[PDB]
Design a protein around this ligand. Structure first.
Ligand SMILES: NC(=O)C1=CN([C@@H]2O[C@H](COP(=O)(O)OP(=O)(O)OC[C@H]3O[C@@H](n4cnc5c(N)ncnc54)[C@H](O)[C@@H]3O)[C@@H](O)[C@H]2O)C=CC1
Ligand SMILES: NC(=O)C1=CN([C@@H]2O[C@H](COP(=O)(O)OP(=O)(O)OC[C@H]3O[C@@H](n4cnc5c(N)ncnc54)[C@H](O)[C@@H]3O)[C@@H](O)[C@H]2O)C=CC1
Ligand SMILES: [Cl-]
Ligand SMILES: [Cl-]
Ligand SMILES: [Cl-]
Ligand SMILES: [Cl-]
Ligand SMILES: [Cl-]
Ligand SMILES: [Cl-]
Ligand SMILES: [Cl-]
Ligand SMILES: [Cl-]
Ligand SMILES: [K+]
Ligand SMILES: [K+]
Lengths: 245, 245, 245, 245
């Protein structure tokens, strides 16, 4: 009934969008969910999961700062014990054409999407490699293989895939799986913030014929986090309705 | 609790090995399973499933002949109703170096592994595209990106991945998902034939440090067959403990 | 002065389109070219190369038939000596939706594009693995990763990529390189035969903004065939102006 | 004749190893070469290219500082005219296991390998988009798809590949090609430091049976930088004797 019962999970950027969708599917499978986010709306997201009957806790955290990541994993374990699942979802966009991208927009996107994902992966690796069990699921983007106006975003997401495949080689023998999910075009506050015509152009590229939901990504994460996906490691699973960006 | 309940699934080459493991997982999820295979032992395989408390039926069929594939879907529907899931696993080996592969061994591997997967996929498409729903899951091989002494096998499995991505672009808008699985080194009777010393050397190369089971491939098939994996389409998922052949 | 000077090369389907473009560039680099094709127009193509000051010979041949492929290499070696370069370009199209592709259109495309490419590669392997030197360049398609209405073509081209990687692993230690080229959309008689709206839709996908020329593919073949590309093996190079089909 | 005559090329980190090998091949093809590196030995490198009868110049430059990258392109064009070719070879290693990598070793590798490549790519894009012609060749690593003890290096090289494909989509219409090269195990003065028993293990992973040379990478750069490779764009070409890291 609940393939993730008795498992603690940390989901970064789970205050809204895809992150909250993953927290909802993990919580539904009986997992204790730690909502890690820099926005105080994460408390409304945790209170929403507890009201549905699940066990959830919000922990304010800027994954770009190592001291806050160390504090995140410390409080999470003092709250729901050992962390068995890590979902690196936290991400941001500062789009610009290569010839216009500012050094500031470059630094912020790489510091959060790439270094941020590194600092979290590291705290999970230090623990999971000793316990001989663990699940690391990184959210990348279909943009990891190129996308106009996303020099900094494609670089960070492509970097997340490289790390995912490196972590697989170092933690696989420790009974840990590290996999990446590349969501195509999902319906969230970020995608609803783009202009009308931009929405239709993207949906016209989706063979399924519609923008995915945050739970579509959550269903794939819940599977990789289960014991049934123990032989899937270092993979990149596209959840974009067959879209080829 | 029974995600595949009320769904009929056809699994080719499921008399023994990986195909039977996939049949056991689909059955465990309360799915009516059809075991299609030339091997007569398939009758004892379907019986083993009816003994576990599931509904199963063996159909002696040669997927290389279109007239027998047309009979497979006809006989499968009048029994358990509309076919919602198709698992193309049937795949034989006739290994030989490129400079010595006989024209006969080539034709046998291609006619069964590639043309066979096409004939089954075609019959599933004619039906699923009208019912506006369906699941096609092709079992290909880590050998699709090359492997010594497998020119005919690498060609066939690489071809299966090519059709998989093509079917995705033609059946996605009809609500049908077409995905492929590439198993690594799976511990089965057929594989427990090579020298034990070569087998231990092969396992030392798997990052996970152990050979997978037929159910490992099944757990992934059961997920792609669920409604929760409706947005995963045209994907190649490796089930080899993070191994790169 | 000329990189491929003193080298004999066989180019299948070099009577027109990409094949003749490849033959023109190889000849420009001082390579003795063997125009292998099933159309008698290859005799005009070979004469056009001899009139340009290069050495060329046409040999009628259906790569689908092994006895005719064996006769091709025999006549090619007694004519210009040992074959140092093999370019598998010969290919056909019998496009149709998965639910309508006839068994005849399936057999013909797989027998030419896949089995035909194999029979040629096999004759090159038998000779090159003994001479300790060689070059095998297979023309695949950007459709190897899927394309609407090309279930048989994608399967055949994907199969060639799989074989390209298998051959690499078996002949790399012999000093032979096996590489594949995936042309995007090249301006030829076949491509100029499709409707005008299809031409604009295909060209609108090319970031470069135009359909490539036959010599663009030939320039890449001339490089892989040189000694400078002795450390490139088992690669899939796209020559489609950055098109992502 | 020489395919790169009258062309100005910038090769970062070309004072030694692969970088200097790339400069030698570009010089041999008649291209003016700007050696950009923090290593003062870059003067002896440029002088060695002038002794061979080519036009070479050394410009001390820290690619992590945008003001020095802006001065590099300014001083480079004032001396040898418009920059037609940009080779991003600059790279460093600060290897460590995921659970040990210091924040400092992470920052220096990302600041030089990823941000450094970005700053140079940006100065090239700003100039090449107005001229309507140009070549950007990024040297990534076989480590972009993962490698033990290289979380930071695999992240920076995978990121370079991500940028490569993004720049392709934004500069293809402007007549500019952006490609990446992934060298496998290359023999350089920066690799003959490990014991031979370590060298043998790495070589047994190379199907070619031997480690490559700096010029094997240079030959591929000279081709992509030629007018004949104008239709190759957004590609990742492996130069590792068919080795799969
Ligand atoms: N939505 C889409 O269509 C696609 C998005 N993605 C990725 O999916 C992830 C989530 O996407 P959305 O839900 O649309 O994003 P969103 O912007 O709607 O929500 C992201 C959440 O991450 C949090 N966050 C951002 N930076 C953070 C940091 N440094 N530390 C902690 N929390 C931080 C924000 O507070 C926010 O709650 C991102 O990594 C995004 O790049 C991937 C491809 C497609
Ligand atoms: N033209 C394009 O845009 C693209 C073409 N390709 C591939 O490039 C190759 C050449 O394409 P095009 O020049 O446009 O085609 P084409 O039809 O103009 O020329 C192909 C040549 O192959 C020969 N041929 C066909 N079957 C043969 C057989 N069984 N034995 C011997 N010769 C045979 C034909 O006589 C013809 O001369 C084909 O393999 C094609 O699939 C792939 C990507 C795109
Ligand atoms: Cl700036
Ligand atoms: Cl920040
Ligand atoms: Cl949702
Ligand atoms: Cl499970
Ligand atoms: Cl033979
Ligand atoms: Cl034979
Ligand atoms: Cl039919
Ligand atoms: Cl530190
Ligand atoms: K994949
Ligand atoms: K490639």
């Amino acid at each position: 009934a609940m393939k993730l019962a008795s498992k603690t999970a940390i989901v970064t950027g789970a205050a809204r969008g895809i992150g909250f969708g993953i927290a909802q599917v993990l919580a539904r499978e009986g997992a204790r969910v730690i909502i890690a986010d820099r926005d105080a709306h994460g408390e409304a997201a945790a209170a929403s999961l507890r009201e549905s009957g699940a066990q959830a806790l919000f922990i304010s955290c800027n994954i770009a700062e190592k001291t806050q990541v160390e504090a995140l994993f410390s409080q999470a374990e003092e709250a729901f014990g050992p962390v068995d699942i890590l979902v690196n979802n936290a991400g941001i966009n500062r789009d610009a054409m290569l010839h216009k991208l500012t050094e500031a927009d470059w630094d912020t996107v790489i510091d959060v999407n790439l270094k941020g994902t590194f600092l979290c992966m590291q705290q999970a690796a230090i623990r999971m490699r000793e316990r001989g069990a663990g699940r690391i699921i990184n959210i990348a983007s279909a943009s990891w293989l190129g996308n106009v106006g996303q020099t900094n975003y494609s670089a960070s997401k492509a970097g997340v895939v490289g790390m995912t495949k490196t972590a697989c080689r170092e933690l696989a023998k420790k009974g840990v799986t590290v996999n990446a999910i590349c969501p195509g075009f999902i319906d969230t506050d970020m995608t609803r913030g783009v202009p009308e015509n931009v929405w239709q152009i993207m949906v016209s590229k989706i063979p399924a014929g519609y923008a995915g939901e945050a739970k579509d990504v959550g269903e794939c994460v819940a599977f990789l986090a289960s014991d049934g996906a123990r032989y899937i490691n270092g993979e990149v699973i596209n959840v974009g309705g067959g879209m080829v960006l």
